[PDB]
Amino acid sequence: THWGYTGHDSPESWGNLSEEFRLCSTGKNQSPVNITETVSGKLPAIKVNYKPSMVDVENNGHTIQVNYPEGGNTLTVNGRTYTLKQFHFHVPSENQIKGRTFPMEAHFVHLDENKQPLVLAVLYEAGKTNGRLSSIWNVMPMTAGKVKLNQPFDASTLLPKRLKYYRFAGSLTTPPCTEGVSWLVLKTYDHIDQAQAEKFTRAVGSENNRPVQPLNARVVIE
Ligand SMILES: NS(=O)(=O)c1nnc(NC(=O)CC2CCCCC2)s1
Numbered sequence: 001t002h003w004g005y006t007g008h009d010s011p012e013s014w015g016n017l018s019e020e021f022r023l024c025s026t027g028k029n030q031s032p033v034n035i036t037e038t039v040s041g042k043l044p045a046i047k048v049n050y051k052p053s054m055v056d057v058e059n060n061g062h063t064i065q066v067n068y069p070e071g072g073n074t075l076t077v078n079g080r081t082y083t084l085k086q087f088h089f090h091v092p093s094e095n096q097i098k099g100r101t102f103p104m105e106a107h108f109v110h111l112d113e114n115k116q117p118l119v120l121a122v123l124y125e126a127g128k129t130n131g132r133l134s135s136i137w138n139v140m141p142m143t144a145g146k147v148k149l150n151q152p153f154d155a156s157t158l159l160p161k162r163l164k165y166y167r168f169a170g171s172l173t174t175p176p177c178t179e180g181v182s183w184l185v186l187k188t189y190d191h192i193d194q195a196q197a198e199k200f201t202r203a204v205g206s207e208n209n210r211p212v213q214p215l216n217a218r219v220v221i222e
């Protein structure tokens with residue numbers, strides 16, 4: 001069933017579009033969130049194991065996604081290795097820090113051996129063109145369709161050297177809004193410029209950011 005960010009299909013309505021999307025409205029750990037107060041805790045360090053891989057880029061009406069057919073881009077935290085299935089973008093950002101909304105957000109989506117989801121998010125400030133993201137922008141399908149990018153791609157370079165993060169539990173930010181998703185949101189911002197935001201949006205069709213969901217009982221660790 002169709003869903004989106006304007007009209008009757010918009011997030012306020014995802015629950016009612018079908019039986020499967022019901023959690024979108026009745027969830028109590030829904031993403032995104034606005035990150036206000038936090039608990040200072042001694043979090044486990046992220047280990048990054050990203051390397052050049054043969055990737056392919058997809059526009060599906062909703063977002064611009066880079067998919068990894070072959071495993072071997074992984075991420076280790078507290079003993080468990082999480083495999084990157086894909087990364088993708090939202091303009092503007094979905095999550096917020098202290099009321100604040102970022103020009104763009106990227107979500108690196110992993111599963112461990114046990115099919116336990118983990119999203120790693122990177123927020124982008126407005127600034128200089130993003131040189132590392134040009135490879136992907138330069139062949140971004142501006143209407144629905146999957147090309148297959150011919151230069152290996154190093155997600156390595158989209159992650160910062162400084163890897164402090166907010167930690168909470170949540171959900172898919174797109175239907176069916178499944179919960180039980182680990183969220184790790186990176187304190188070091190990257191950057192994109194005006195041209196890049198508008199181009200992603202041009203292509204996707206609209207702003208693609210679900211509204212911030214109430215934390216409820218959840219604590220964000222910092
Ligand atoms: N907008 S977002 O970053 O929260 C999303 N990222 N991935 C999404 N869906 C999938 O990755 C497929 C897969 C299917 C079942 C296991 C978990 C997720 S929504």
Ligand SMILES: [Zn+2]
Pocket residue numbers: 088089090107173
């Ligand atoms: Zn996302």
